[PDB]
Amino acid sequence: ETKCTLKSFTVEKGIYQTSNFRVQPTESIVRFPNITNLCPFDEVFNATRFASVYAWNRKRISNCVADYSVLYNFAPFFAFKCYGVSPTKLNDLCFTNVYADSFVIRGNEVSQIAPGQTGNIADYNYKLPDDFTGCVIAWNSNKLDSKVGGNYNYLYRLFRKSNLKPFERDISTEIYQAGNKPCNGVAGFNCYFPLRSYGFRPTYGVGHQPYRVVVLSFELLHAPATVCGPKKSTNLVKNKCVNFNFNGLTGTGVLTESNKKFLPFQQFGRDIADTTDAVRDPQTLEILDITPCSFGGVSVITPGTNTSNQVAVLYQGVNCTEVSNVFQTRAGCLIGAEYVNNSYECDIPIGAGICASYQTQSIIAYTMSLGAENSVAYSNNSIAIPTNFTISVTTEILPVSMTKTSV
Amino acid sequence: DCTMYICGDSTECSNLLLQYGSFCTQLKRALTGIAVEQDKNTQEVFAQVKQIYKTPPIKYFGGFNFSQILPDPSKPSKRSPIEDLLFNKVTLKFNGLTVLPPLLTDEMIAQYTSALLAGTITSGWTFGAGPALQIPFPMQMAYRFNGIGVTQNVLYENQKLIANQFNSAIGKIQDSLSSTPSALGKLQDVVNHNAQALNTLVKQLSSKFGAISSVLNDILSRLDPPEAEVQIDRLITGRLQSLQTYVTQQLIRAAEIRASANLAATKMSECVLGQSKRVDFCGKGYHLMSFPQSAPHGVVFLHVTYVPAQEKNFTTA
Amino acid sequence: LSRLDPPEAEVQIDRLITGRLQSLQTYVTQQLIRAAEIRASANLAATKMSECVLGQSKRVDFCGKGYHLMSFPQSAPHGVVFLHVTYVPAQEKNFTTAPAICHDGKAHFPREGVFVSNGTHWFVTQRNFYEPQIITTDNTFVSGNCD
Amino acid sequence: DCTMYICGDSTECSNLLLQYGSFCTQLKRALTGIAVEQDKNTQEVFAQV
Amino acid sequence: SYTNSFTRGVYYPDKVFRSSVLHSTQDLFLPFFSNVTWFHAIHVDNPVLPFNDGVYFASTEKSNIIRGWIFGTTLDSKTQSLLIVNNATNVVIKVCEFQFCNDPFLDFRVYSSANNCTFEYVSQPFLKNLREFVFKNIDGYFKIYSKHTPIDLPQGFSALEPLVDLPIGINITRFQTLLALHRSYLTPGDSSSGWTAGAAAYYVGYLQPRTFLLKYNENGTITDAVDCALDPLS
Ligand SMILES: *[C@@H]1O[C@H](CO)[C@@H](O)[C@H](O)[C@H]1NC(C)=O
Ligand SMILES: *[C@@H]1O[C@H](CO)[C@@H](O)[C@H](O)[C@H]1NC(C)=O
Ligand SMILES: *[C@@H]1O[C@H](CO)[C@@H](O)[C@H](O)[C@H]1NC(C)=O
Ligand SMILES: *[C@@H]1O[C@H](CO)[C@@H](O)[C@H](O)[C@H]1NC(C)=O
Ligand SMILES: *[C@@H]1O[C@H](CO)[C@@H](O)[C@H](O)[C@H]1NC(C)=O
Ligand SMILES: *[C@@H]1O[C@H](CO)[C@@H](O)[C@H](O)[C@H]1NC(C)=O
Ligand SMILES: *[C@@H]1O[C@H](CO)[C@@H](O)[C@H](O)[C@H]1NC(C)=O
Ligand SMILES: *[C@@H]1O[C@H](CO)[C@@H](O)[C@H](O)[C@H]1NC(C)=O
Ligand SMILES: *[C@@H]1O[C@H](CO)[C@@H](O)[C@H](O)[C@H]1NC(C)=O
Ligand SMILES: *[C@@H]1O[C@H](CO)[C@@H](O)[C@H](O)[C@H]1NC(C)=O
């Protein structure tokens, strides 16, 4: 690695930095609140009785969790079709309005509830837009919406002057003028009533049994998308650097226990350097500190390929408790060398007053010696007078000029 | 870390970072060169002596008092009261920014300072020009007074007065260094500059440099990969420029520190390890001797000066 | 300029020029810093040449470690090597020292050197070489009594 | 002054300039430091007496 | 009348924690030493109150004097307006499109003629009894900050803590207070219902985009905040 970093084959003696040590996260936990609200789908699917098709009700949902889990409500659906939105991908989408329309029609009339259809229910009772984005759920309800004597409680409009607009509701009961005179508002020849009854019976055929059909209208009006389904629910890893996604706040690190108290409304937390070091868990009220795990830099201490090939590793600025004689110093932690107790001359600088060398055998590590020890006898009546002279030569090399270059 | 500071735990960001060139292997190289150069300036001034000298047990040099400059064996850290006072006044891994500790700690520099003090007190100036020669302190002071032209009689007769003046000056050194905290600024402001250099990089990471967001997790989740590549490229360019200007400032400050360290080593060699005839290179006035004291990021020289006073008018021919 | 048309490849050339200018400005800054460093080194070398080769200086370690006597320069393709001749004392010996000598009620002090004693004897010497000489009036001066 | 050198009589330009960061904050600080240092060099040679 | 807001109008700029540090932020704050309007002697006109940069509402009511607030565009037909009513143990916030009179009163129960909306937002009821409120509307969020501190406006320091958020975007340009009395007045045109009651006073102060430097202590509570465009020292 040192040869690749220096781009050579015969490295010299010393310490060289090659790369950095990083601990990869094992898991990735996400924590959101358990539940705040929920769409009342138990009311629009498990009601005691639904309304007619000419007077269909519409319930607005704007402050609830859009949890699409219709599977537990009569899972053997007879007609489960989706328009514009995928069936399974709908659970991970946000919208503006979650208007839900419900009505009861015949078995052979469920096909008319679709974008671009022609018939009595589609044109005179309930019309869907062409570019409709939603889902249509229909299930059999013969046991509930039919009696032996005839369930004439559900009515439908059969005659009307013109077709209904998409998402239009009309409850008018005016006598339809089929002839030339308005009949002055009486029932007679060419004066027919618009609403007709069904009279569901349990002995009817599959095409005539009542089918509770519900329409989930979806639309996006560039709103903050208050409605949203469930996100996730995981545990809390301790003493290990993992990936946290707390309420959109994403990061990687260790979540350790702390003792500082926060405010009831404060959830996040930053230091003076604008670094996220504290975040409140959405599951339970408890603050934890964000501290990174083992992180630093690796350095190879080599005596040079001319002598031998045994090298030593040094992790700088990181404790080596977590992930060959291991020894902890003040400037880092070195492996591959043994700490000697006799101080010699410093050869390879490491830091904090520790230097490595080759004993001649293996890499050593010793506290650098500042020199020898010599204490002169200081006396008020003694002196040291020289006797001999020595003429020595001292070399002092200093650069003068440089390489004149131009581009 | 040129890979971590620009790219935050991202693989494609690191794959795109190598397209700029060899700047990651150049800025880190310049930084480690600055570190090695700073590791050498500490050995050109404090490590001038070859052998460590010690103080004799008899605390009687002739009448002078060196208790405030000699190390005190009572305290755990073997330093002088002046060094302990100076140490209590210098106020001292985030996003891939580490601080490498120096080789020579505060203990080895203290040992070098004590050795230099012992050499300049017991041996005089012979410890810095060859073998150490024993010599009494009053005779060393007589040599230093004769080196500037003053006869040795004024010292061999009026010795108690000079000793009392030196003791009073050593005592008032601490009272003068206690008040006016702006005196120890040259050792702090540069450190403050580090506080304005190591923290200014993380402060600029919150800026989007024109992008939609500052973190990569939002860009790689909101926008599409093919169209968000220009935003990542612009962020990498901005971070590279913000790191290059920091490297340039660090180079300039390292050159300044190198010049200051060369000047300090020259003053240590020409004032502590001998007496110089220069005017104000070893303090204003007539220089006699100099005592060095260590500091976590510098050296304090106390120069003893002989100043004439109480002059009178006379006739000359 | 061959794969894409100039009207559709202008931003690429602009970004290339910007990147190359940014890479060259850093080189220019490094060259300026290194030129300042070399200028300081050359000024120091010229000062040492003037104060060590063209005369003798009283500085301690500016013209070599020890007592400087002379200096010889030697050229090199990118620098200069100064060979400093240093006089170093050695083979020192212990002797007894005294500030002055009180005789005839007067305290005499030496002019050059100090008084060395090796046992029931006293001589005058210098501060750099042992030369025992009898205490005479030429190398001594009276400056009062030993009170 | 970067606010006037980079943006000539423009408010949106000044708003977008702060988005870049604290480049001007350190630039003007270095300029003031250079000014103070040049004001100090005249007192170390002429103001010795 | 007109009073001077010496050192009040500060709130938390974000839901972050800090420990004895300094934060300079450019937000929409109330300028210190500003000339606010004190409507104390107006005991039921001037119903034109803008909502440009927010509302700083200071109250010193004894007990249950104010019944709520209104925030609309023009208070006309087909106008998105939010009415907030604070009862004894319940609070309601309803946004709808309906016309309002000059001074909607409560004692009453039905303000307008018809209110056909299906909005639902229920929270904790809000209402030496100083009560400060800061109302802003930004990024489709109608943010409100409430604080109940003892003691008109003294020289103390008290921040505004965010409690609830409402995602809604409306060009609000109106502001109306809801007074509570005893006598009945069903006529919407007659704007004269002065009755002897406790002290009623609603301060009105407009916010401004300014830069504030706040100091966060070790506990994470705003204890000091200075402006940058009112004094050379600041
Ligand atoms: C979520 O459930 C846990 C376990 O019962 C509970 O401690 C916590 O308070 C719940 N969250 C909220 C917001 O109530
Ligand atoms: C090998 O080469 C290195 C390079 O400087 C040198 O330091 C070392 O002494 C050499 N070893 C031998 C055994 O020649
Ligand atoms: C590293 O961890 C060990 C284990 O507790 C500890 O004894 C040692 O002091 C740590 N090193 C540093 C520099 O804190
Ligand atoms: C140094 O001393 C320690 C403790 O006395 C011992 O554990 C270690 O083995 C010694 N090292 C060597 C190289 O002997
Ligand atoms: C030297 O001074 C210190 C205090 O400055 C004092 O405690 C000590 O006794 C003095 N020693 C002598 C020998 O005067
Ligand atoms: C010498 O005399 C002048 C006036 O003739 C006077 O100003 C000066 O102070 C005198 N010198 C001293 C040392 O008093
Ligand atoms: C002088 O004497 C001391 C001890 O009395 C001794 O350590 C020293 O070596 C002697 N000097 C020489 C030059 O031998
Ligand atoms: C001292 O040195 C002198 C040199 O002139 C010599 O004559 C004398 O004998 C010496 N005395 C002793 C005791 O060595
Ligand atoms: C506030 O404004 C009113 C009228 O706008 C004025 O009468 C009053 O003096 C002002 N108050 C201050 C403190 O300026
Ligand atoms: C009105 O206040 C009463 C308590 O006096 C409370 O029971 C009721 O729910 C409140 N009504 C609304 C709509 O908040």
Author numbering:
A (entry chain A): 298 to 620, 640 to 676, 690 to 736
B (entry chain C): 737 to 828, 854 to 1078
C (entry chain A): 981 to 1127
D (entry chain B): 737 to 785
E (entry chain C): 27 to 70, 80 to 142, 157 to 176, 187 to 210, 215 to 297
Wording from the paper:
The enhanced interaction of Omicron BA.2 spike trimer protein with hACE2 may be one of the key factors that contribute to the increased transmissibility of the BA.2 strain.
The matured spike protein contains two subunits: an ACE2-binding S1 subunit and a membrane-fusion S2 subunit. Extensive structures of the spike trimer reveal the open and closed conformations for the three RBDs within the spike trimer, where the open “up” RBD conformation is prerequisite for ACE2 binding. Upon ACE2 binding, the spike trimer undergoes conformational changes to expose the FP motif of the S2 subunit to initiate membrane fusion that allows the release of the viral genome into host cells.
